[PDB]
Amino acid sequence: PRTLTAQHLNKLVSVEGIVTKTSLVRPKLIRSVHYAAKTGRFHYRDYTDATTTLTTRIPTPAIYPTEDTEGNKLTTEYGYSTFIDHQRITVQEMPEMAPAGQLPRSIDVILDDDLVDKTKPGDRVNVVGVFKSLGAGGMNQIGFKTLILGNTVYPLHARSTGVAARQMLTDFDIRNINKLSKKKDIFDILSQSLA
């Protein structure tokens, strides 16, 4: 987060640091379905925003339908609509790689749908994603709004930290682990190898 500058915007990057805060997982409305009792018909609509497509589009600000093309009143069908989850997290440079006595640097990561609940505050993490500039930096009237749209989130383990360490076991590894057992001095061999 300290060596990430304005010359790396619009490129895929890997960032190291510590997770300092996570927000509440909220639903996001995509498609909404309705019912008209005067015609027995169901209607739908779609919604989109700027944080779902990597390229810039022309905005379409559609509205929430309460009324039919003739004027019939519509009932909202909450069970038939589609919702997708959302979360935001903040990353900061790890305390044992940061310069002593100096204030730290941080970066915002946006996660959606399946990557929404993978970490907790106070974790070592590695994130990969696109470093995006958003909106207009006051030219319609500080600078531009910058954030990472996450695609990969890796938990990492370090000494004196709440993330556990696990390894993938190969069948070859299993064979040695199981072979060692039969010999009746397992305790001594494992004990003498402890520091």
Partner: peptide, 21 residues
């Protein structure tokens, strides 16, 4: 007339967004 008829609770929410405007 969508703005003066602040009719639905999600309609006045669809009326906002696009950063600050």
């Amino acid at each position: 007339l969508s703005t003066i008829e602040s009719e639905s609770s999600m309609a006045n929410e669809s009326n906002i967004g696009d950063e600050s405007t």
